[PDB]
Design a protein around this ligand. Structure first.
Ligand SMILES: Cn1cncc1C1=CN(c2ncnc3[nH]cnc23)CCS1
Lengths: 403, 20
């Protein structure tokens, strides 16, 4: 990326390209730098000035950025339409055959189910209204439904249907048969750097999409990333997602993945998602999270402590990227600077990353889960199968009237 | 190693969320 090479802004003046070219070429001119790599950097700087100073060459190099901007502007128009008029009551419980449980939580459970007409398989998230009111998660579960129905991105699980009855709220999502990234990661031990990087790039792209909508995800962790049949991530579990234009304050999420400013009483923004990306890349490459302890407050002390220990098998580029994502100071954290996500996409650790190809899913997955049909749930763990009770009376009607 | 401390800790399981 030529602007990064020259230390420049896309909207740079012709003059500012000329001086940045003189400024950067000096720091690598053989007369002043015979260190390893000085000569290739000197070539790259000359290349950058040549593209950026020629108006025709610059106009078409600028198309990469302009296509991203156009893609995001359209994604926003589409999102805002569904955001303003959300889908409600687009199916009914009796339309589905409940198979088995695929996962659980404080709120309820996700069940493998099959549509009785079309035979299609889905994952139905069941939430008990009373429990949700009890755990004061009303707005959170309204955020989740309204956000998941309105977004559309290759690495976000699709909400297919939603509805409620007297007792429960229901979210019927696309079924992802490959299982959680958590199981595979714990089983394999750790991913190799190019393996972690393949997943990380998909997350970077998804956060770029989500933050352009002013959405904060707030629960990045391997438990929440599903592997599809071509080995690509599907993000599920939007129970802490929120639309936030300015700042927000809630202490929620998973202790291991919380940014300092979530734990601290001050408010925070979308930058907490980039901190959690740092935690995720660390856990993926190391096999364990960088802040674990028995008590949450012990985890909180390590998080705000500003100190991180890296395994020996961590490359220099990985540690340098992780130092910038796991940056306690908000004004220094990657993702949160003037250049935003581009600082992350232009980082050396990602140098081999073909972003367009990732987005198109043209890249070969380094892991494809062992499949045996559209219902071989062996990539998921087994859970106790409780039965689904629907009361004769509507519980919490008012609290959930917009669901 | 820290990875050894990780599995020597029983807490290699699914992490609970918090919502204060
Ligand atoms: C506990 N939980 C809270 N939100 C999501 C979950 C989970 C869902 N799982 C899914 N498995 C398959 N296809 C899916 N499609 C959408 N979700 C899933 C199982 C892991 S946990």
């Amino acid at each position: 990326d030529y602007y990064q090479t020259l230390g420049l802004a896309r909207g740079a003046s012709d003059e500012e390209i000329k001086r940045a070219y003189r400024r950067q070429a000096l720091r690598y001119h053989p007369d002043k730098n015979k260190e390893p790599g000085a000569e290739e950097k000197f070539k790259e700087i000359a290349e950058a000035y040549d593209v950026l100073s020629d108006p025709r060459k610059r106009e078409i190099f600028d198309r990469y950025g302009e296509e991203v901007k156009e893609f995001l502007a359209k994604a926003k128009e589409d999102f805002l339409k569904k955001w303003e008029s959300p889908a409600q009551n687009t199916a009914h419980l009796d339309q589905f055959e409940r198979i088995k449980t695929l996962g659980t939580g404080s709120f309820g459970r996700v069940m493998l189910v099959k549509h009785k007409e079309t035979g299609n398989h889905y994952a139905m998230k069941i939430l008990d209204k009373q429990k949700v009111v009890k755990l004061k998660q009303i707005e959170h579960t309204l955020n989740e439904k309204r956000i998941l129905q309105a977004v559309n991105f290759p690495f976000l699980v699709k909400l297919e249907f939603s509805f409620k009855d007297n007792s429960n709220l229901y979210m019927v999502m696309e079924y992802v048969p490959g299982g959680e990234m958590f199981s595979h990661l714990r089983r394999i031990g750790r991913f190799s750097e190019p393996h972690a990087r393949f997943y990380a790039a998909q997350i970077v792209l998804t956060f770029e999409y989500l933050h352009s909508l002013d959405l904060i995800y707030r629960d990045l962790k391997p438990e929440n990333l599903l592997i599809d049949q071509q080995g690509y991530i599907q993000v599920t579990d939007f129970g802490f997602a929120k639309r936030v234009k300015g700042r927000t304050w809630t202490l929620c999420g998973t202790p291991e993945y919380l940014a300092p400013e979530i734990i601290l009483s001050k408010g925070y923004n979308k930058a907490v998602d980039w901190w959690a990306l740092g935690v995720l890349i660390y856990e993926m490459a190391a096999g364990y999270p960088p802040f674990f302890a028995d008590q949450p407050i012990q985890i909180y002390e390590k998080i705000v402590s500003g100190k991180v220990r890296f395994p020996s098998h961590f490359s220099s580029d990985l540690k340098d990227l992780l130092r910038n994502l796991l940056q306690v100071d908000l004004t220094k954290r990657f993702g949160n600077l003037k250049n935003g996500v581009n600082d992350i996409k232009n980082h050396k650790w990602f140098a081999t990353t073909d972003w367009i190809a990732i987005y198109q899913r043209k890249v070969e997955a380094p892991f494809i889960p062992k499949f045996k049909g559209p219902g071989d749930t062996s990539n998921f763990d087994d859970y106790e199968e409780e039965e689904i009770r629907v009361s004769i009376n509507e519980k919490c009607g008012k609290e959930f009237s917009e669901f | 190693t820290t990875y050894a401390d990780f599995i020597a800790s029983g807490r290699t399981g699914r992490r609970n969320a918090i919502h204060d």
